Symmetry: D2
Subunit: 238 residues, 4 copies
């Protein structure tokens, strides 16, 4: 399937590893130029080397940035604009009795992470994409988590409604269980066997499997799709 | 229907007018003692006089408080505890290209309004209600608005799950169009005719109509209901 | 709370036992005259007797009727009209799909056709029947007793879940139409409520998985955040409220009544 | 993107025109062999000819069949098996309920029974039929073409919405069962997509409200945030992706493809 992505410029946040990284791969495969970023500069360099060597015809800008900080995010965007003159795709992918436990500071702190992180990065790409009349934004979306994720889901709806007139489409993807660094991490922090028993597919998803969907949403082929959140979860949501 | 509310202590935020006020009325009618609050002290005194005179057998504590400020909210709760020794009910009711328009400050500011406002007031009543083994919390729940409301809806789900074991039930109610001060306000800021045409009931709801539901959720009769958000909207959500 | 129900005429289908029976009790207690029904005569008489003796101040009409059959359902409504001249409240409550098989390919057309000709058409038909009556008087309440499988379908409930989703959508569409006539249509999704059908459901899934009802119950309970199975009285409360004058601005919605089951 | 579809055998129901036809084109283009069908012979031949000439490298089998009838649907699958020995992809696509009447009380049992015996049982039956086939080979994709009325029901769509909600629930339940067999079941809800049925829908609602199709279209458009009606190609893209090896971790979901209609 021709996805019409040749020479599109894709900013993928959190692309030094896991889902972010595979997405970057898959976009370069469709012929995108990339902006990959992350805060670990060494992790990112590795990502960068691997990418450049697999995709020698594609431009790849690497920028060390924390997309939870305002200044870094503005510079990320301005640096990408300086480099390519356009940004066509944004994949927002950054990190997310008990309840009565959580202070005001604890709540404000998670709002100023990924919540405000995705909103701000969106705000920042919107004028560029509207100018181009071409845009794709894919948000990669557990009490604190669920509140932010619900907020993001509705943010997606409302922003899609507004920018659809400019062919700037915005959607979200909900991972179930995906074999990423954090996950081989946060089950060595056999237990896996108990998760498999909860996934109707009896199997954990690959980052490749996850990326396939994001790339399709980021393509020309998805031109009539906007405002939706799609679970990618091996059937967990059944 | 006997709602089992005799001598229950109900904190109703925003009860100097509109929905908040009618809820307070309806709770006193079922035999609750009240804590009513608001920032307009004069509006609140009027509410208070009207209440006291309609319900002379019921205790009514009035406290001037902004339930969007941390300090006011802690004092509101501690003042109510000092007065009655318990708080049985909490009704959280406080006030809620364009998008790329909104700054980080603009977003953080609305998070620190009603979003954090309901979460904090909940956190603050939870230990009291758990101790009593009896609790009812009803959250009265448009881009900024919709994001906070989505966040609150999911917050409701998660907190209900956690405190259900203590018979502290928490639910939410979504108003459609209700004839409140703000609404006779924000359609004189005939236009009404265009809203009626959107409400399948061809009529705007009364605060009485709205309160009936909240009071039922706040009652003993609702002992098996928790974690849900109910629209009260004359059929708008059809 | 005054529900404004004194002398309303209420038809509760499947009211000889379980959820429907307790709803009828509670509507009687608010001052309604009832029409109650069931398929088994002896059960129904037992329910009628208990109601008549507990609420002798209220008229109660009991009719043997299968509200999955058109004839009986048409007759039910006419007999209710001949007696009372009006019907103010309908509670659609009747048996949903059986618990025998859930493996999908193994279900034939016939098994689906029956499903659809049961509770599904049952509630729609009875709704079509009471609508003109409620409309002409501009007062009407219909409460569909559905099931949470309609929202979140379960392994033992493929058929049931399909029926329930459908009825949840029907609810919205009809509420939209009748709204301007003060005829309000809502639905309630019981989670797990202690009735004969639930106890029968326990009995047999134990036998089938080679365990006891008790351990089945224990399992269910671990999934309910309130850690208990609801009572028919707890469930009737909400149904009675929705059937009331107090619910006058609520239409088109389906509410889970489930001890938090939906929040888990 | 390589979709991994080379030599998959795909059955697209209702493929002589509109959404189904464009899906078939697009599956052919990815390297699938097709089974296409319809009720009208002359239309079908026209579709077959166009496909055969456009994609002569691919086997195409065309059969006249009403996939609302059990006989024809059973025969369809056997004829498909006799030809290819396997079926890898099913796209459930057939006519839903008529646009004539939406006022509810005015719909009889028979009108509902037909509804339920149409697209509703049609998709369920055909699903039951292809399931063992896909299961034995551990590869299967089924994509149900439903409708947004299933999520958000509309005044001109009471019946349709009821059917669609039901099918959306069916989707979840069957996906859960077949998931471990790498047989994936999803659904797509078209918003407004420019087909013969949509143009026919325009024609007649104009006539009925005493306006022109153009002004009906203008009205629809004002409600679509993209301010345009979708193309069958735009819609086929997503269906083809879901039928693909690339969609290997997606099951049990229904996706709106609607130019933002759901976000409004
Ligand atoms: N994995 C899963 O199954 C699930 C994932 N999600 C969500 O999907 C997204 C992907 O997670 P996953 O791949 O598992 O996580 P990983 O931690 O495995 O990968 C995260 C990647 O993003 C980078 N990153 C993280 N934070 C920032 C930041 N603030 N600024 C710039 N780069 C950042 C990391 O590099 P560095 O640390 O160097 O910046 C790394 O490359 C997350 O938002 C997560 O919340 C949600 C539910 C389940
Ligand atoms: N009315 C409607 O149709 C809709 C309402 N809602 C929500 O329902 C709730 C009720 O709104 P409604 O009655 O219309 O609003 P009104 O402004 O009519 O009434 C609000 C009441 O709450 C008080 N109040 C407001 N803010 C605070 C605060 N920060 N601290 C303490 N008291 C406060 C007000 O008094 P004072 O100003 O003196 O504090 C007043 O008594 C709101 O949260 C609103 O967002 C949502 C959608 C529609
Ligand atoms: N109990 C629960 O936890 C749940 C209940 N539900 C739903 O709630 C409703 C009530 O269930 P429940 O109270 O548990 O069931 P019970 O079997 O315990 O009670 C059912 C009552 O309805 C009568 N009845 C059943 N079908 C018909 C019919 N076609 N015509 C007339 N009367 C009928 C029965 O009498 P007779 O057999 O003699 O007619 C009996 O009086 C059902 O729709 C069920 O699907 C859904 C999910 C969970
Ligand atoms: N177009 C839209 O915007 C929307 C479409 N949908 C749904 O999407 C699907 C496709 O609709 P659309 O492409 O617009 O319809 P069209 O009528 O334009 O195309 C339908 C095709 O399917 C065939 N067909 C219809 N019913 C049957 C049957 N029982 N057996 C075999 N073939 C059949 C028709 O041929 P013949 O008549 O000769 O059999 C024709 O080839 C339908 O399920 C519809 O309900 C839902 C909402 C909106
Ligand atoms: O799934 C639902 O909610 C149902 O409608 C079916 C049902 C009926 C009775 C029970 O005891 C359990 C399940
Ligand atoms: O409501 C839906 O989504 C449907 O399934 C019915 C439908 C079918 C074709 C149309 O052109 C419009 C509506």
């Amino acid at each position: 399937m021709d996805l019409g992505l040749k020479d599109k410029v894709a900013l993928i946040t959190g692309s030094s590893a896991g889902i972010g990284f595979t997405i970057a791969e898959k976009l370069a495969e469709e012929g995108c130029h990339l902006i990959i970023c992350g805060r670990n500069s060494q992790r990112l360099e590795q990502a960068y080397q691997s990418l450049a060597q697999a995709y020698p015809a594609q431009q790849i800008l690497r920028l060390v940035a924390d997309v939870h900080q305002a200044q870094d995010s503005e510079q990320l965007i301005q640096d990408s604009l300086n480099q390519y003159g356009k940004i066509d795709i944004l994949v927002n992918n950054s990190e997310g009795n008990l309840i009565e436990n959580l202070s005001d500071e604890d709540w404000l702190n998670v709002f100023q992470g990924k919540l405000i992180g995705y909103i701000r990065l969106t705000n920042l790409v919107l004028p560029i994409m509207k100018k181009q009349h071409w845009g794709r934004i894919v948000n990669i979306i557990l009490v604190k988590s669920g509140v932010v994720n619900a907020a993001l889901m509705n943010f997606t709806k409302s922003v899609a409604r507004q920018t659809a007139p400019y062919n700037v489409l915005i959607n979200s993807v909900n991972p179930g269980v995906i074999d990423t660094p954090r996950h081989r991490e946060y089950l060595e922090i056999l237990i896996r066997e108990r998760i498999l028993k909860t996934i109707p597919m009896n199997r954990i998803g690959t980052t490749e499997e996850f990326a396939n969907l994001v790339v399709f949403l980021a393509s020309e082929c998805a031109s009539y799709i906007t405002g939706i959140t799609i679970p990618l979860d091996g059937g967990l949501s059944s």
